[PDB]
Amino acid sequence: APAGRQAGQQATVDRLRTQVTGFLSGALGKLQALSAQNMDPELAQFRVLDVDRAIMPLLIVAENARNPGLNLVPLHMDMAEDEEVRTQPPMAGSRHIAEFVASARPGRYRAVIDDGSHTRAADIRKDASGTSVIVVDPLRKEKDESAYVDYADNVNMEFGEHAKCAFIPVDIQKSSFDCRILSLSLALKMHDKDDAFAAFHETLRNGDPSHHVSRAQQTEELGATLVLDGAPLVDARMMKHGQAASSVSRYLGNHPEQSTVPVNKRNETLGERTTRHLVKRKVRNRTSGETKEITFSNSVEQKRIALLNRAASYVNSAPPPVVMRMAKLLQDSLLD
């Protein structure tokens, strides 16, 4: 019974519980309906950017509780604090990296890093020796691979010049609004490959990345690591939600050994699973005009739905202090 754990607040708790599940499940029902009807959300006038920003802090709480040791913390870069450049304010509970590095208790963390307009995933190690970070970006649209040099340097400068850093840009995202669900999934995959990421942190502080990645280079300015080929650290299980079939196939062509390993309990290969998620629909054009018809994997929209399902279930059976916390995180999203 929960009457013992309610501290006489069963009225406020029970009402905040309904309020949070109502929003999570309310978003779930529309997204499930749009996905089942094979319709693009932004063409259907669903404001995914705002829903993804409001549910994210609540998803992390659920994921942190579902997998202890994930230690997933939302963080943002300095440019995210600038109301002039940013397209959206950082999500509720988000911390400035400088504040985090200075005050975070030593240990292992996962993170989603908002720069104001885009979000990446990260694996952070903080101890006496220093802080080290492995950043995986689900977007790779830069035409010339020199912006990644800047990104790697820009990420290192945000964590401190004494931090060891690796920047891994990966061709997963194709849409404009999926960078939050993709980064959240990469974080979960990081905790899944915890051992492999710890051995990379070790090599970062000490030799040859060849035991961990296929292609890497130190940057001229800060000597941070830029990885333009993350395999095998970036394996098939990290490429599952690649939206373009050409990205998954190019990746498998470059790393054939990843084409036969199981990516889930159903024993699907990366290629089998992506094919199962291929849909054909109209999307917004980013000549002429407005829309274009494409064939892509709806894995991310299915994953957004599956994550909302998890969170809504967690809250239904969550203890009051968790309910209070998630209700506040939702209210805090209407600030800024």
Ligand X SMILES: O=P(O)(O)O[C@H]1[C@@H](OP(=O)(O)O)[C@@H](OP(=O)(O)O)[C@@H](OP(=O)(O)O)[C@@H](OP(=O)(O)O)[C@H]1OP(=O)(O)O
Ligand Y SMILES: CC(C)(COP(=O)(O)OP(=O)(O)OC[C@H]1O[C@@H](n2cnc3c(N)ncnc32)[C@H](O)[C@@H]1OP(=O)(O)O)[C@@H](O)C(=O)NCCC(=O)NCCS
Residues that bind ligand Y (CB under 6 A): 139, 141, 173-176, 243-246, 283, 286, 294-296
| DSSP H or E run through 59 | helix 48-66
Contact 97, 87 (CB under 8 A): no
User: Which of ligand Y, ligand X, none sits in contact with 10, Cβ below 5 to 8 A by type?
Assistant: none
* Residue 289 beta carbon to ligand Y: minimum distance, rounded to whole angstroms: 14
Burial (0-12, 13-18, 19+ Cβ within 10 Å), 179: buried
25 is in an annotated binding site: no
* Residue 225 beta carbon to ligand Y: minimum distance, rounded to whole angstroms: 24
Residue ranges that bind ligand X, judged by CB under 6 A: 185, 188, 192, 240, 263-266, 303
264 is in an annotated binding site: yes
Q: Which of residues 67 and 176 has its CB atom nearest to ligand X in the complex?
A: 67
User: Which of ligand Y, ligand X, none sits in contact with 264, Cβ below 5 to 8 A by type?
Assistant: ligand X
Q: Which of residues 19 and 32 has its CB atom nearest to ligand X in the complex?
A: 32
User: Which of ligand X, ligand Y, none sits in contact with 175, Cβ below 5 to 8 A by type?
Assistant: ligand Y
Residues in contact with 104: Cβ distance below 8 Å, sequence separation at least 6, in sequence order = 73, 126
Contact 168, 136 (CB under 8 A): yes
Q: How far is CA 26 from CA 21, 157, 181, 217, 221, in A?
A: 8, 40, 18, 46, 48
The one-letter amino acid at 126: K
Q: Which of residues 34 and 204 has its CB atom nearest to ligand Y in the complex?
A: 34
Q: For residue 182, how many other CB atoms are within 10 A of its CB?
A: 28
* Annotated binding-site positions: 66, 174, 189, 237, 240-241, 246, 264-265, 273, 292, 295, 303, 310
